[PDB]
Amino acid sequence: SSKYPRSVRRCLPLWALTLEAALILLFYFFTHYDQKGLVASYQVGQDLTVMAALGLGFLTSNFRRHSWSSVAFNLFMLALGVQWAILLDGFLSQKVVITLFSIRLATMSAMSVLISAGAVLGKVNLAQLVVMVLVEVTALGTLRMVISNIFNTDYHMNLRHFYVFAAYFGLTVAWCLPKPQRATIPSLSAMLGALFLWMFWPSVNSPLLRSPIQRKNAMFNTYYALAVSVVTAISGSSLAHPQRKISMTYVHSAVLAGGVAVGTSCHLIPSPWLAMVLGLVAGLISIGGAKCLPVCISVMHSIFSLLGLLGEITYIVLLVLHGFQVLLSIGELSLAIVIALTSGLLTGLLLNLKIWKAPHVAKYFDDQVFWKFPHLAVGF
Amino acid sequence: ALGIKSCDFQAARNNEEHHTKALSSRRLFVRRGQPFTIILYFRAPVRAFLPALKKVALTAQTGEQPSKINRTQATFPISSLGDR
Amino acid sequence: EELQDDYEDMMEENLEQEEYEDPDIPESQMEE
Amino acid sequence: DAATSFLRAARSGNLDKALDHLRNGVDINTCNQNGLNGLHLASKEGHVKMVVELLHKEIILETTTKKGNTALHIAALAGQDEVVRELVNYGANVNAQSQKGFTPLYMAAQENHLEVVKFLLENGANQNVATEDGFTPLAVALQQGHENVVAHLINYGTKGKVRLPALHIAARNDDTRTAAVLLQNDPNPDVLSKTGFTPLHIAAHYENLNVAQLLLNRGASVNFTPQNGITPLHIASRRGNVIMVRLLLDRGAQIETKTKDELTPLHCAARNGHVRISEILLDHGAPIQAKTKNGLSPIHMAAQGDHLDCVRLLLQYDAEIDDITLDHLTPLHVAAHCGHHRVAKVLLDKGAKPNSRALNGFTPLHIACKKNHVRVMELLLKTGASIDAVTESGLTPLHVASFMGHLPIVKNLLQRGASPNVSNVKVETPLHMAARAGHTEVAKYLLQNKA
Ligand SMILES: CC(C)CCC[C@@H](C)[C@H]1CC[C@H]2[C@@H]3CC=C4C[C@@H](O)CC[C@]4(C)[C@H]3CC[C@]12C
């Protein structure tokens, strides 16, 4: 088939405008409005927004000729995902009352999709990413509602599983795609994104904590675990590389190792030494995954999935201290992984449809497929 | 409506083209890798050529136990997109 | 493979211009 | 409805439906509202068989779209390698320019189509042709970050067309369809390669009778002599292509044409031992006594190649058995030099003089003894060759053999009654030569004899 991209002049605008019109109509029909800590509560959601846009958009900008698409497509996906998540958490957890807390939770739902998209960025166009956003937000909401119905937990509190759900969903969608690199300046921009993610990840580890002391302890644990993980990741990178040099690409994701490791249990860790130990173990596991997983597509997504699983395991280990609860939590994790993989299969089969006008496999990771550039021959 | 009346293998012409005319003028002797011509005769006039072409395939077999893995059996359609 | 003969150098080597020339009439003088 | 359906079939690659439409009477040069004919759509979608069939049905190859794009432009932008190769094989202009000045190489370079870029460069695409904005393929490749395309464009530079012309390629494969399309487009059957050879030369080399007949019927020169002087008849005679030789002779090929080294087609036939070709050329009037720059007649060439039956046929056609080169070498001298005792037997049985003298006085016996050719030696001594003949320097065959250290030759010469006490111009016996060359065994057999 032709390696020259098909015109999306009718598909993409119609798709995006119809989506926006439908969202506006649903907001009109189903959403409704409504102090001292107004700015303080706004800042947590703002920090999540800063992470979702800047850190996640630039973290994947490391590709040589795909930085524009990474950043701008992440922005588009965030804008769509927050609106759709507001509507979906409204529908599955009751009209929809819009508060800053609801915007914060919808932002978390959007960041789940934004994390998943890193495994597929450079291999899809904007319409495929729209489909991925819609289906993944719906699947995450369905998983949370199922957990709320079965295990009698709160719908909003079930959003803790979003690391492991995002990792396995992204891996599955990437596995379904057809089968197919760095530059210095995009690497520095990706480092900017990784630094913002690393700096504000304590805001990821406590949006859903109502109590102040729980937020305090979780934030402290995330901060110290992230510091330890940064040191371990930078130092051990030379071991897990053929040329014995530090890999910037490895550092960009392995900095977040401790934050993911303590993500679901930072509120239950009682002393900073335990969080520091967990950050160290996360860094060592990151070294091992970098050195061993490529032997057995995105390796960084693979070690992210392993680290999310490890965070769930350490939550299981800690939850006993603070065996039927073990069985219930293992069933919860297994259900989360099963739903993530199944919805990832469905999303990948939907993405493989011809009508999406997906880029040719010879044109992966290239901004010229989607973006205007000067002095190019256009059309036939 | 796609019944076959007869098939002419054109042994004389093909044997002349395939340098086997000394062998026979009645039996079809052909050499591999080079095309030969046959004429298929239908009992009734063929109304629509393209659906009829979609309806017909050819099979060549050699030996007592022909199979694809032995390359002793090949099934191919009648189309201009065939591998010559 | 199967397309090297489409190039001018390979065709030149295939046509063997040296085979149409009188190479030499060697004597190999016994003395020196 | 019919033209639109034909264009849809061309887009989808439905060759059967498109061929049915063309049989019905649809104009093959019809195009859509964008100016894309069936060839353009097939080149876009990479349908190689459809492209080939439409070229065979006489579609205008250089038809441009409303944007000035030829089929090669569209195949290069779409990255259809096989379509690009096929279009170039049928005579697509690799340096064609659209309305905005884009070339196929520019389109391939901007789309990071490395294989298309390399193929176009090998086919003479000029990378210096700029667009109306002044951009080159290198410039757009640099702007888009296509590092491999940039590297290949720099490394190629201005080397030029290293592929053969398309008609030479067609003649090499005996492909009459592509040659017919090419000659319909370009009516010159004598297109020159960089080496100076016509497609008729290639057809004669491979004995491609069909394309040779087509080229000759379209006005190819049967007598095209390049600078080296190698006509197609020379090539066909050298390669042993009997049917090509007959065809070329029937179309007016000259029998007496000489190459740069004054080789006739009979020289080439005799050099490689082609008896039937030599007989055909002789029956057409080829001079059997023609000489090269070194004075070699065809019997010399046949003796040089150990071509016994060619020597027999030349002798039957009244070739001079004692013809000499500029070094006064007879065919018997050549047969002795190369060790061909069968050729020597045929020559001696037909009356060749066994004691012919070369420039330095060497007989065939001297040359056989020099090169350790014992069978030629016994054959010559069996047919009255002088065992005591001397050269201008007074060298006997025993002298030569002792200097070269050929023990069997020395043994046979002394057993047949050669005196070991002969002397050179300087008083130097065979024992002197053996001592000087340090041949201990030859000297020992000499001393055990009467030396
Ligand atoms: C519903 C059951 C009981 C009976 C239905 C059978 C009828 C509808 C089917 C069975 C076999 C069919 C026929 C099979 C073959 C041909 C040849 C084709 O070139 C024209 C149509 C024709 C002639 C078909 C017409 C429809 C047909 C007669």
CSV table of N, CA and C in Angstrom, one decimal, chain D residues 153-266:
chain,number,residue,atom,x,y,z
D,153,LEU,N,22.8,10.6,-0.4
D,153,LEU,CA,22.9,11.7,-1.4
D,153,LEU,C,24.2,12.3,-1.4
D,154,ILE,N,24.9,12.5,-0.3
D,154,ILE,CA,26.2,13.0,-0.2
D,154,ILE,C,27.2,12.0,-0.9
D,155,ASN,N,27.1,10.8,-0.5
D,155,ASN,CA,28.1,9.8,-0.9
D,155,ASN,C,28.0,9.5,-2.4
D,156,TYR,N,26.8,9.6,-3.0
D,156,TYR,CA,26.6,9.4,-4.4
D,156,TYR,C,27.2,10.6,-5.2
D,157,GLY,N,26.8,11.8,-4.8
D,157,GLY,CA,27.3,13.0,-5.5
D,157,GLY,C,26.8,13.0,-6.9
D,158,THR,N,27.8,13.2,-7.9
D,158,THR,CA,27.5,13.3,-9.3
D,158,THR,C,28.1,12.1,-10.1
D,159,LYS,N,28.0,10.9,-9.5
D,159,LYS,CA,28.6,9.8,-10.3
D,159,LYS,C,27.8,9.5,-11.5
D,160,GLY,N,26.4,9.6,-11.4
D,160,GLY,CA,25.6,9.5,-12.6
D,160,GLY,C,24.9,8.1,-12.8
D,161,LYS,N,24.5,7.9,-14.0
D,161,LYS,CA,23.8,6.6,-14.3
D,161,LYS,C,24.8,5.5,-14.4
D,162,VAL,N,24.7,4.6,-13.4
D,162,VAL,CA,25.5,3.4,-13.3
D,162,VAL,C,24.7,2.1,-13.7
D,163,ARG,N,23.4,2.2,-13.9
D,163,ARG,CA,22.5,1.2,-14.5
D,163,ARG,C,22.6,1.3,-16.0
D,164,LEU,N,22.4,0.2,-16.7
D,164,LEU,CA,22.3,0.2,-18.1
D,164,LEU,C,21.1,0.9,-18.6
D,165,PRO,N,21.2,1.4,-19.8
D,165,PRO,CA,19.9,2.0,-20.4
D,165,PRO,C,18.9,0.9,-20.5
D,166,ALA,N,17.6,1.3,-20.4
D,166,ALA,CA,16.5,0.4,-20.2
D,166,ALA,C,16.4,-0.6,-21.4
D,167,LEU,N,16.7,-0.1,-22.6
D,167,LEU,CA,16.7,-1.0,-23.8
D,167,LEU,C,17.8,-2.1,-23.7
D,168,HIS,N,18.9,-1.8,-23.2
D,168,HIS,CA,20.0,-2.8,-22.9
D,168,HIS,C,19.5,-3.8,-21.9
D,169,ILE,N,18.8,-3.4,-20.9
D,169,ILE,CA,18.2,-4.3,-19.9
D,169,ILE,C,17.2,-5.2,-20.5
D,170,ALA,N,16.3,-4.6,-21.4
D,170,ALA,CA,15.3,-5.4,-22.1
D,170,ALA,C,15.9,-6.4,-23.0
D,171,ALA,N,17.0,-6.0,-23.7
D,171,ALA,CA,17.7,-6.9,-24.6
D,171,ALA,C,18.4,-8.1,-23.9
D,172,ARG,N,18.8,-7.8,-22.7
D,172,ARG,CA,19.5,-8.8,-21.9
D,172,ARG,C,18.5,-9.9,-21.4
D,173,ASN,N,17.3,-9.5,-21.2
D,173,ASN,CA,16.3,-10.5,-20.8
D,173,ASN,C,15.4,-11.1,-21.9
D,174,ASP,N,15.7,-10.7,-23.1
D,174,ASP,CA,14.9,-11.1,-24.3
D,174,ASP,C,13.5,-10.7,-24.2
D,175,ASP,N,13.2,-9.5,-23.6
D,175,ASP,CA,11.9,-9.1,-23.2
D,175,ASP,C,11.4,-8.2,-24.4
D,176,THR,N,10.5,-8.7,-25.2
D,176,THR,CA,10.0,-8.0,-26.4
D,176,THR,C,8.9,-7.0,-26.0
D,177,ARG,N,8.2,-7.2,-24.9
D,177,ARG,CA,7.1,-6.3,-24.5
D,177,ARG,C,7.7,-5.0,-24.1
D,178,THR,N,8.7,-5.0,-23.1
D,178,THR,CA,9.3,-3.8,-22.7
D,178,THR,C,10.1,-3.1,-23.8
D,179,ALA,N,10.8,-3.9,-24.6
D,179,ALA,CA,11.5,-3.3,-25.7
D,179,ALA,C,10.5,-2.6,-26.7
D,180,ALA,N,9.4,-3.2,-27.0
D,180,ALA,CA,8.4,-2.6,-27.8
D,180,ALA,C,7.9,-1.3,-27.2
D,181,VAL,N,7.6,-1.3,-25.9
D,181,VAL,CA,7.1,0.0,-25.3
D,181,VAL,C,8.2,1.0,-25.4
D,182,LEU,N,9.5,0.6,-25.1
D,182,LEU,CA,10.6,1.6,-25.1
D,182,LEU,C,10.8,2.2,-26.5
D,183,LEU,N,10.7,1.3,-27.5
D,183,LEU,CA,10.9,1.8,-28.9
D,183,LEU,C,9.7,2.6,-29.4
D,184,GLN,N,8.5,2.3,-28.9
D,184,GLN,CA,7.4,3.2,-29.2
D,184,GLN,C,7.6,4.5,-28.6
D,185,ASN,N,8.2,4.6,-27.4
D,185,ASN,CA,8.5,5.9,-26.8
D,185,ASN,C,9.7,6.6,-27.5
D,186,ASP,N,10.8,5.9,-27.4
D,186,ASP,CA,12.1,6.4,-28.0
D,186,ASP,C,12.4,5.6,-29.2
D,187,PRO,N,12.4,6.2,-30.4
D,187,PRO,CA,12.5,5.4,-31.6
D,187,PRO,C,13.9,5.0,-32.0
D,188,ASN,N,14.9,5.2,-31.1
D,188,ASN,CA,16.3,5.0,-31.4
D,188,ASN,C,16.7,3.6,-30.9
D,189,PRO,N,16.9,2.6,-31.8
D,189,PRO,CA,17.3,1.3,-31.3
D,189,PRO,C,18.8,1.2,-31.0
D,190,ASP,N,19.5,2.2,-31.5
D,190,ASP,CA,21.0,2.2,-31.3
D,190,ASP,C,21.4,3.0,-30.1
D,191,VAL,N,20.6,3.0,-29.0
D,191,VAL,CA,21.0,3.7,-27.8
D,191,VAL,C,22.3,3.2,-27.3
D,192,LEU,N,23.2,4.1,-26.9
D,192,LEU,CA,24.5,3.8,-26.5
D,192,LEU,C,24.6,3.7,-25.0
D,193,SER,N,25.3,2.6,-24.5
D,193,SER,CA,25.7,2.5,-23.1
D,193,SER,C,27.0,3.3,-22.9
D,194,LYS,N,27.5,3.4,-21.7
D,194,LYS,CA,28.7,4.1,-21.4
D,194,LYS,C,29.9,3.4,-22.0
D,195,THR,N,29.8,2.1,-22.1
D,195,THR,CA,30.9,1.3,-22.7
D,195,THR,C,30.8,1.4,-24.2
D,196,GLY,N,29.7,2.0,-24.8
D,196,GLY,CA,29.6,2.2,-26.2
D,196,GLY,C,28.9,1.1,-27.0
D,197,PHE,N,28.2,0.1,-26.3
D,197,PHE,CA,27.6,-1.0,-26.9
D,197,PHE,C,26.1,-0.7,-27.1
D,198,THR,N,25.5,-1.2,-28.2
D,198,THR,CA,24.1,-1.1,-28.5
D,198,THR,C,23.4,-2.2,-27.9
D,199,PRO,N,22.0,-2.1,-27.7
D,199,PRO,CA,21.3,-3.3,-27.3
D,199,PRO,C,21.4,-4.5,-28.2
D,200,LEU,N,21.7,-4.3,-29.5
D,200,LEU,CA,21.9,-5.4,-30.4
D,200,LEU,C,23.2,-6.2,-30.0
D,201,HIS,N,24.2,-5.5,-29.4
D,201,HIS,CA,25.4,-6.2,-28.9
D,201,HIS,C,25.0,-7.1,-27.8
D,202,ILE,N,24.2,-6.6,-26.9
D,202,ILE,CA,23.7,-7.5,-25.7
D,202,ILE,C,22.9,-8.6,-26.2
D,203,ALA,N,22.0,-8.4,-27.2
D,203,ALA,CA,21.2,-9.5,-27.7
D,203,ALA,C,22.0,-10.5,-28.4
D,204,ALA,N,23.1,-10.1,-29.1
D,204,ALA,CA,24.0,-11.0,-29.7
D,204,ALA,C,24.8,-11.8,-28.7
D,205,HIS,N,25.2,-11.1,-27.6
D,205,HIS,CA,25.9,-11.8,-26.6
D,205,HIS,C,25.1,-12.9,-25.9
D,206,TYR,N,23.8,-12.7,-25.7
D,206,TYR,CA,23.0,-13.7,-25.0
D,206,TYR,C,22.2,-14.5,-26.0
D,207,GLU,N,22.4,-14.3,-27.3
D,207,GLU,CA,21.6,-15.0,-28.3
D,207,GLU,C,20.1,-14.9,-28.0
D,208,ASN,N,19.6,-13.7,-27.8
D,208,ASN,CA,18.2,-13.3,-27.6
D,208,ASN,C,17.6,-13.0,-28.9
D,209,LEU,N,17.2,-14.1,-29.6
D,209,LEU,CA,16.8,-14.0,-31.0
D,209,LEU,C,15.6,-13.0,-31.2
D,210,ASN,N,14.6,-13.1,-30.3
D,210,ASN,CA,13.4,-12.3,-30.5
D,210,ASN,C,13.6,-10.8,-30.4
D,211,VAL,N,14.3,-10.4,-29.3
D,211,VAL,CA,14.6,-8.9,-29.2
D,211,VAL,C,15.6,-8.5,-30.2
D,212,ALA,N,16.5,-9.3,-30.7
D,212,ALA,CA,17.4,-9.0,-31.8
D,212,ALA,C,16.6,-8.7,-33.1
D,213,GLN,N,15.6,-9.6,-33.4
D,213,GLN,CA,14.8,-9.4,-34.5
D,213,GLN,C,14.0,-8.1,-34.4
D,214,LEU,N,13.4,-7.9,-33.2
D,214,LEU,CA,12.7,-6.6,-33.0
D,214,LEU,C,13.6,-5.4,-33.3
D,215,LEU,N,14.8,-5.4,-32.7
D,215,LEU,CA,15.7,-4.3,-32.8
D,215,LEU,C,16.1,-4.1,-34.3
D,216,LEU,N,16.4,-5.2,-35.0
D,216,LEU,CA,16.7,-5.0,-36.4
D,216,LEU,C,15.6,-4.6,-37.3
D,217,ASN,N,14.3,-5.0,-36.9
D,217,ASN,CA,13.1,-4.5,-37.6
D,217,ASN,C,12.8,-3.1,-37.3
D,218,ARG,N,13.3,-2.5,-36.2
D,218,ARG,CA,13.1,-1.1,-35.8
D,218,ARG,C,14.3,-0.3,-36.2
D,219,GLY,N,15.2,-0.8,-37.1
D,219,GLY,CA,16.2,0.0,-37.7
D,219,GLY,C,17.6,0.0,-37.0
D,220,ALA,N,17.8,-1.0,-36.1
D,220,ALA,CA,19.1,-1.1,-35.5
D,220,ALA,C,20.2,-1.4,-36.6
D,221,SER,N,21.4,-0.9,-36.3
D,221,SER,CA,22.5,-1.1,-37.2
D,221,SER,C,23.1,-2.5,-37.0
D,222,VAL,N,23.0,-3.3,-37.9
D,222,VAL,CA,23.6,-4.7,-37.8
D,222,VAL,C,25.1,-4.6,-37.9
D,223,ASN,N,25.7,-3.4,-38.4
D,223,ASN,CA,27.1,-3.2,-38.5
D,223,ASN,C,27.7,-2.2,-37.6
D,224,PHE,N,27.0,-1.9,-36.5
D,224,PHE,CA,27.5,-0.9,-35.6
D,224,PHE,C,28.8,-1.2,-35.0
D,225,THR,N,29.8,-0.4,-35.4
D,225,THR,CA,31.2,-0.6,-34.9
D,225,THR,C,31.5,0.5,-33.8
D,226,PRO,N,31.7,0.1,-32.6
D,226,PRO,CA,32.1,1.1,-31.6
D,226,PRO,C,33.6,1.4,-31.8
D,227,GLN,N,34.2,2.1,-30.8
D,227,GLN,CA,35.6,2.5,-30.9
D,227,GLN,C,36.5,1.3,-30.9
D,228,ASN,N,36.2,0.3,-30.1
D,228,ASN,CA,36.9,-1.0,-30.0
D,228,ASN,C,36.7,-1.8,-31.2
D,229,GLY,N,35.8,-1.5,-32.1
D,229,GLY,CA,35.6,-2.2,-33.3
D,229,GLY,C,34.8,-3.6,-33.2
D,230,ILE,N,34.2,-3.8,-32.1
D,230,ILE,CA,33.5,-5.1,-31.8
D,230,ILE,C,32.0,-4.9,-32.3
D,231,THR,N,31.8,-5.5,-33.5
D,231,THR,CA,30.4,-5.5,-34.1
D,231,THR,C,29.6,-6.6,-33.4
D,232,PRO,N,28.3,-6.6,-33.6
D,232,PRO,CA,27.5,-7.8,-33.1
D,232,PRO,C,27.9,-9.1,-33.7
D,233,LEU,N,28.3,-9.1,-34.9
D,233,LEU,CA,28.8,-10.4,-35.5
D,233,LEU,C,30.0,-10.9,-34.8
D,234,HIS,N,30.9,-10.0,-34.4
D,234,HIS,CA,32.1,-10.4,-33.6
D,234,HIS,C,31.7,-11.1,-32.4
D,235,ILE,N,30.7,-10.5,-31.7
D,235,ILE,CA,30.2,-11.0,-30.4
D,235,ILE,C,29.6,-12.4,-30.6
D,236,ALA,N,28.7,-12.5,-31.6
D,236,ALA,CA,28.0,-13.7,-31.8
D,236,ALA,C,28.9,-14.9,-32.2
D,237,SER,N,30.0,-14.5,-33.0
D,237,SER,CA,30.9,-15.5,-33.4
D,237,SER,C,31.8,-15.9,-32.2
D,238,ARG,N,32.2,-15.0,-31.3
D,238,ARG,CA,33.0,-15.3,-30.2
D,238,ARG,C,32.2,-16.2,-29.2
D,239,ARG,N,30.9,-15.9,-29.0
D,239,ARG,CA,30.1,-16.6,-28.0
D,239,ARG,C,29.6,-18.0,-28.5
D,240,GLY,N,29.8,-18.3,-29.8
D,240,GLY,CA,29.3,-19.6,-30.3
D,240,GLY,C,27.8,-19.6,-30.6
D,241,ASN,N,27.2,-18.4,-30.8
D,241,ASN,CA,25.8,-18.3,-31.1
D,241,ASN,C,25.5,-18.5,-32.6
D,242,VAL,N,25.3,-19.7,-33.0
D,242,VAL,CA,25.2,-20.1,-34.4
D,242,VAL,C,23.9,-19.4,-35.0
D,243,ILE,N,22.8,-19.4,-34.3
D,243,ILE,CA,21.6,-18.8,-34.8
D,243,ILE,C,21.7,-17.3,-34.9
D,244,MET,N,22.3,-16.7,-33.9
D,244,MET,CA,22.5,-15.3,-34.0
D,244,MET,C,23.4,-14.9,-35.2
D,245,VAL,N,24.5,-15.7,-35.4
D,245,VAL,CA,25.4,-15.5,-36.5
D,245,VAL,C,24.6,-15.5,-37.8
D,246,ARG,N,23.8,-16.5,-38.0
D,246,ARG,CA,23.0,-16.7,-39.2
D,246,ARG,C,22.0,-15.5,-39.4
D,247,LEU,N,21.4,-15.1,-38.3
D,247,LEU,CA,20.4,-14.0,-38.4
D,247,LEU,C,21.2,-12.7,-38.8
D,248,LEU,N,22.3,-12.4,-38.1
D,248,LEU,CA,23.0,-11.2,-38.4
D,248,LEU,C,23.6,-11.2,-39.8
D,249,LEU,N,24.0,-12.3,-40.3
D,249,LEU,CA,24.5,-12.4,-41.7
D,249,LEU,C,23.4,-12.2,-42.7
D,250,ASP,N,22.2,-12.7,-42.3
D,250,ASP,CA,21.0,-12.5,-43.2
D,250,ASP,C,20.6,-11.0,-43.3
D,251,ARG,N,20.8,-10.3,-42.2
D,251,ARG,CA,20.4,-8.9,-42.2
D,251,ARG,C,21.5,-7.9,-42.7
D,252,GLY,N,22.6,-8.4,-43.2
D,252,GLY,CA,23.6,-7.6,-43.8
D,252,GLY,C,24.9,-7.4,-43.0
D,253,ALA,N,25.2,-8.2,-42.0
D,253,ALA,CA,26.5,-8.0,-41.3
D,253,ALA,C,27.7,-8.3,-42.2
D,254,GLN,N,28.7,-7.4,-42.0
D,254,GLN,CA,29.9,-7.5,-42.9
D,254,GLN,C,30.8,-8.6,-42.3
D,255,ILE,N,31.4,-9.4,-43.2
D,255,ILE,CA,32.1,-10.6,-42.8
D,255,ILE,C,33.6,-10.2,-42.5
D,256,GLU,N,34.1,-9.1,-43.1
D,256,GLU,CA,35.5,-8.8,-43.0
D,256,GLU,C,35.9,-7.7,-42.1
D,257,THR,N,34.9,-7.3,-41.2
D,257,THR,CA,35.2,-6.2,-40.3
D,257,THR,C,36.2,-6.6,-39.3
D,258,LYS,N,37.1,-5.7,-39.0
D,258,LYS,CA,38.2,-5.9,-38.0
D,258,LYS,C,38.0,-5.1,-36.8
D,259,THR,N,38.4,-5.7,-35.6
D,259,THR,CA,38.4,-5.0,-34.4
D,259,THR,C,39.5,-4.0,-34.3
D,260,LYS,N,39.8,-3.5,-33.1
D,260,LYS,CA,40.9,-2.6,-32.8
D,260,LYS,C,42.2,-3.4,-33.1
D,261,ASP,N,42.3,-4.7,-32.7
D,261,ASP,CA,43.5,-5.5,-32.9
D,261,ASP,C,43.4,-6.3,-34.2
D,262,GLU,N,42.5,-5.9,-35.2
D,262,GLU,CA,42.4,-6.5,-36.5
D,262,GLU,C,41.9,-7.9,-36.4
D,263,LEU,N,41.0,-8.2,-35.5
D,263,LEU,CA,40.4,-9.5,-35.4
D,263,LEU,C,39.1,-9.5,-36.2
D,264,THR,N,39.0,-10.5,-37.2
D,264,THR,CA,37.8,-10.7,-37.9
D,264,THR,C,36.8,-11.6,-37.1
D,265,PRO,N,35.6,-11.7,-37.5
D,265,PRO,CA,34.7,-12.7,-36.8
D,265,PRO,C,35.2,-14.1,-36.9
D,266,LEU,N,35.8,-14.5,-38.0
D,266,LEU,CA,36.4,-15.8,-38.1
D,266,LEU,C,37.5,-16.0,-37.1
